[PDB]
């Protein structure tokens, strides 16, 4: 009914097989068994071979070995030195006798991945006859959050409806979760919340005996692929649910109504991971209704969850979303820190503050937030978008790792130089008791999963990003597309090559210099530059005859600058300095300003919108070549989706040259068309 | 649960009592029956009296007779000279003895019409001792389309949901459909549709076995005061609850399909008013579906509908609702004309073409539709819109009737001077079968029934224009204020002046010049200046740094200015000439361009959003000083509207105003405030 995505497992040839005779489990836990399960699977469906599951070696059998440190008979010096939970070591025997792999976890989950690891080198076609790896995740969680909704609708889902729900219920049995699962897991995932943020009325019961024994059969499936389960939650649940007068945090009552209900949820769920909750924005309910800040109002679910090892993770997406267009000295982009800033070290060390990517809403492009590197005292954790509700909604290429290693490698000096975002939210800059990133799933009913069938690389990647933030984008995209489509080296080149250039392309054609949005408003889908411009939702471009862009100077704009630390707040205060790629963010400029790069802004508008219509038409000419190589149902898929891009592209550039032109009255220096 | 409205009958002092002891019912059909019990309700209510109903004269008794002209003993020469059917007369007895008043119908709804306008009489204070009035209508086809859902949603609905319709069913029983038929009836409505153009997946079902009981019952009531039911069509029945594999209408099949549903209708309705049709219009089904034409497709129904004497009316709201807006050439003003111009003569006699007052979408200004005067052998009926969709949903007050007298009596020239759009529509220019004026529904489930209190005089209004065109704004408005607040000379002409100038400050402050648009796309409420600007609906304004408006000429644009006959053609060709209201209709002119007022066209811009705001306010003020004058729940239901349209209209001048500073760079010339 769907696609293996990247565990495809493909058949090798007679050239490429291995001899093994026996896998030897030496736990029976349910991880341990879903590892040997996928073992089984992946040798069987690659290397046609069955070898027999027991739980002693056989000395003379060529043999994988899966266990933790406490089952092996020698202890070796690398397995030794793992300190990670869910780390783990591969290592061939190099005894001349019979061929041993070892695979041996720091816990049952380490051995899990392991396998994984395991099976994606042979699909990689890599030799394993010397094998010696150690891995441990930097990141503590690995988290995707959904965006579904009961009705079996998914806010911003471009792929498909839910896989959780329909009609107001569960969809009972649960195949597909299990692969979910295994998809997750083979990445590294290890936690997951299956409900929108948005909590609507038939959602905010999932914390209730009516759904939990639904909720927790869920988490029965994830919680054998190491993943565990956090729903998101209505803060005002007391009231709707509780036949509470309030949900006050400093409510005596109300904060012994949400201890009775972690409670009960841990007798249907006892590892249950916690709750996600978005408060106090888009007219969400939260502390502020009680006039109180968002330390009491964590801290009092932070306390309730304490007792069962739960987690807090509250979203910093806060902001004033009833902007007056007129007020020029409000910036949207400083909110977030001027909300939480002031409460560093008021939180319960179960609270996490999850903050996006950057200061306004998953654009093509943004600064970073400025909150990461500035609450040592408060645990942080990164929030990315997996799917693409402003960077093409997979109507368009849009592979996304580039633009997430910019901003994990970003260096927010906090502690001078060598302070990148990914050492904030991996903890080791702070010290974090728990920290790391997650992610908005892309996934939907669509048997493909992902809406784009190149957006499954979006997934995968932003698994092995949260595994290892320090993995290049060239491999990443080099893993995936070999195990999607296969090692042929003109397949491999030229998908990678896509990916790797699709985010570029696509910001090509959209907004220019950084200034976001230029979307229609409601989808979020195509060009409209005035779109939210007199709203109010604090989007603003300044667009007039003459100039464009957020002065966020200090000097004579909203001061947003000065939320960074020195170094970067320098940077970007300076028109001459600013990144031309960050300019209309930080700066109003005229039409005819000068960029590093020797363009006007306006020409720059122009090139780089007439380019990325070229560009898209090269990503569909150099897949068309690949027809012959790619399954026919997977190639017209994908080349379905390229010319719908190439189509919508034509109009971005259109909408956004005409706006310009009739604005700024200035032509395009080469005499291309602009209607 | 209700407001009366209109017919409110309220109780009158000891000095202005009438006496009678009878009422002489000649007829007991079920038309006479509601005359007569209207008669009782408004001489019981002002009155206070109860005069008996009896169906013999007594020579000695003052009373009020109801009769025709067969029960007449003696027929005089006025009413002798009535020739429409739903004529009257009202005429007191010129006798010295008793008090008697005639009211003297052609058929039993003309005593209906007659006892409504003798009510209103009273209510109004009117001297009846000598009483002489012949009223005839002079539109024939009187009528209301509902824009209801079965869902109870109402689609541009801004005064409650559906009274017809909930949870895909009818409302069952009914007072309140018997409330709205008393107060259609008495402005002179005798038509209704009572479901959305916008045929969806249940009211595909009205004209079935399923709902056609339902829609019996209600069409009872309405037979009762004189009003003919009507239902909306999905033109791709046959295939949507038919089973045939085509709707084409020349498919034999289909006909005989159609027949046959005409004669299951006609059993549960033996007098059904017909269909109404929305075909080949924003992606709703047609004949063009199948490769036909609008004569072919209307036909086809109207054979359907010819044995059993009903008609179709075939909406001319056709257009390219997928127009690339860099296609200047196509002009969506023009569409309806070029659609619907070719096919005059070839339509059967029970169609008639159904034309908005405007060739785009009830903007609050639009030059007349050039339909109307162009087809003198096809039947045609003008629509207007009574639901304020763009002229400000019953939040901002706005009286149309002003706007429909302009439309009414603007001169086509059709057949040289005096061919007004009335004399079009009321067939007498061209002699046509059927014709005459529809208007969409302003009410919905709210008490005072239409949102805004004030716009009852809406209904109200369009009743009595389609009654009689040539009724001036002035005592429409002074005949709805008397009965609905009473005769107090302040409030008369307080609320009386607010009517009349309201639709002129909403101009005022919304898009210039005729231009249009400038609309929130979805919902249409409040001001977006690009907001369909790069959209596919056909509605640009094309402003720039430079100027503004769609070039309609024939010398360098559109062409759309030929549709007119010449001397109109002429009049909107030349820059010169074209008035002011709609130049930017038909002329692209610089923002320098001086008016006929002497303005610019930017300081005009400038200049109406300031003042219309302090119109607004102004509006507010005159209200407040009816304090006192006024019970309390109307005067803070009103005032509560006006503070909401004077906090709006700020919102749409400064918008506008900011919009075209950054675009003209034009300061205003008094120096306000433009943020
Ligand atoms: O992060 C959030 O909560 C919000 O992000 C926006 O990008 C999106 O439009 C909303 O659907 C969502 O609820
Ligand atoms: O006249 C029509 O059919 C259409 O008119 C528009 O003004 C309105 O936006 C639509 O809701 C409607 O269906």
Not at 69 to 96: A, C, K, M, N, Q
Not at 492 to 501: D, G, Y
Not at 604 to 621: D, M, P, S
Request: charged fraction near 25%; charge should be negative; aromatic fraction near 12%.
């Amino acid at each position: 009914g769907y696609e293996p995505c990247w565990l495809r497992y493909e058949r090798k040839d007679q050239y490429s097989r291995l001899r093994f005779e026996e896998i030897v489990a030496k736990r029976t836990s349910p991880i341990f068994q879903a590892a040997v399960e996928e073992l089984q699977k992946g040798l069987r469906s690659m290397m046609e071979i069955e070898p027999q599951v027991v739980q002693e070696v056989n000395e003379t059998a060529n043999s994988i070995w899966l266990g933790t440190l406490e089952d092996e008979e020698f202890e070796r010096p690398l397995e030794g030195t793992l300190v990670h939970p869910e780390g783990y070591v591969i290592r061939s025997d190099v005894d001349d006798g019979p061929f041993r792999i070892y695979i041996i976890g720091k816990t049952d989950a380490g051995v899990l991945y392991g396998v994984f690891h395991f099976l994606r080198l042979l699909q990689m076609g890599e030799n394993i006859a010397q094998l010696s790896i150690i891995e441990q995740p930097k990141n503590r969680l690995r988290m995707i959050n959904h965006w579904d909704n009961m009705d079996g609708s998914i806010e911003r889902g471009y792929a498909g409806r839910s896989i959780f729900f329909v009609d107001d219920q569960f969809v009972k049995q649960n195949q597909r979760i299990k692969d979910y699962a295994r998809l997750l897991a083979s990445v590294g995932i290890n936690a997951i919340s299956i409900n929108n943020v948005n909590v609507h009325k038939t959602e905010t019961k999932l914390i209730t005996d009516h759904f939990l024994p639904d909720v927790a059969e869920v988490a029965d499936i994830f919680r054998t692929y190491g993943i565990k389960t956090f729903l998101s939650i209505n803060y005002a649940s007391p009231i709707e649910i509780g036949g509470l007068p309030t949900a006050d945090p400093l409510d005596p009552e109300v904060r012994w109504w949400w201890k009775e209900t972690a409670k009960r949820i841990y007798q249907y769920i006892p590892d249950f991971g916690g709750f996600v909750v978005k408060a106090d924005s888009e007219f969400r309910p939260g502390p502020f209704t009680y006039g109180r800040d968002h330390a009491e109002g964590a801290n009092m679910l932070a306390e309730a969850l304490a007792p069962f090892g739960g987690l807090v993770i509250w979203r910093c997406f806060v902001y004033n979303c009833q902007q007056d267009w007129r007020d020029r000295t409000t910036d949207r982009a400083k909110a977030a820190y001027d909300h939480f800033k002031p409460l560093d070290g008021q939180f319960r060390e179960n609270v996490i503050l999850q903050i996006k990517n950057g200061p306004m809403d998953f654009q093509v492009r943004e600064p970073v937030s400025p909150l990461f590197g500035a609450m040592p005292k408060t645990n942080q954790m990164m929030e990315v978008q997996i799917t693409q509700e402003y960077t093409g909604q997979q109507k368009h290429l849009c592979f996304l790792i580039p633009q997430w290693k910019e901003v994990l490698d970003f260096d927010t000096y906090a502690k001078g130089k060598g302070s990148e975002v990914k050492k904030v939210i991996d903890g080791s800059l702070f010290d974090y008791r728990y920290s790391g990133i997650a992610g908005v799933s892309n996934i939907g009913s669509d048997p493909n999963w992902t809406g784009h069938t190149l957006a499954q690389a979006n997934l995968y990647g932003f698994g092995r990003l949260a595994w290892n933030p320090d993995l290049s984008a060239e491999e990443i995209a080099n893993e995936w597309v070999v195990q999607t489509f296969g090692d042929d080296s003109q397949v491999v080149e030229t998908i990678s090559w896509m990916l790797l250039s699709s985010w570029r392309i696509y910001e090509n054609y959209t907004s220019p210099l950084g200034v976001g949005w230029m979307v229609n408003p409601g989808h979020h889908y195509g060009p409209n530059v005035d779109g939210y411009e007199y709203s109010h939702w604090g989007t603003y471009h300044y667009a007039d005859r003459d100039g464009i862009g957020v002065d966020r100077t200090v000097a004579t704009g909203t001061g947003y600058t000065a939320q960074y630390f020195p170094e970067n707040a320098a940077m970007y205060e300076s028109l001459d300095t600013c990144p031309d790629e960050l300019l209309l963010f930080f700066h109003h400029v005229p039409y005819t300003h000068r960029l590093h790069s020797g363009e006007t802004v306006i020409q720059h508008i122009y090139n780089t919108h007439f380019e990325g219509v070229e560009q898209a038409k090269q990503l569909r000419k150099r897949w068309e070549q690949l027809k012959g190589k790619i399954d026919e149902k997977r190639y017209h898929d994908v080349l379905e989706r390229l010319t719908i891009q190439v189509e919508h592209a034509k109009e971005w550039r259109d909408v956004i040259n005409t706006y310009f032109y009739r604005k700024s009255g200035i032509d395009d220096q080469y005499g291309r068309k602009i209607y």
